Amino acid sequence: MDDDHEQLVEELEAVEAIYPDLLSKKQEDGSIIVVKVPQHEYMTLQISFPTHYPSEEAPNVIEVGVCTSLAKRDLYDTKYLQHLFQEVMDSVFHRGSVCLFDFLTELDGVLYVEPEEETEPVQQSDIPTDPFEGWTASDPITDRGSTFMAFAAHVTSEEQAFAMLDLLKTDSKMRKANHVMSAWRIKQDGSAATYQDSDDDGETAAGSRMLHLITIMDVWNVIVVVARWFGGAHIGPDRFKHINSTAREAVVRAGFDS
Question: How many other CB atoms are found less than 10 A from the CB of residue 122?
Answer without folding.
Answer: 11
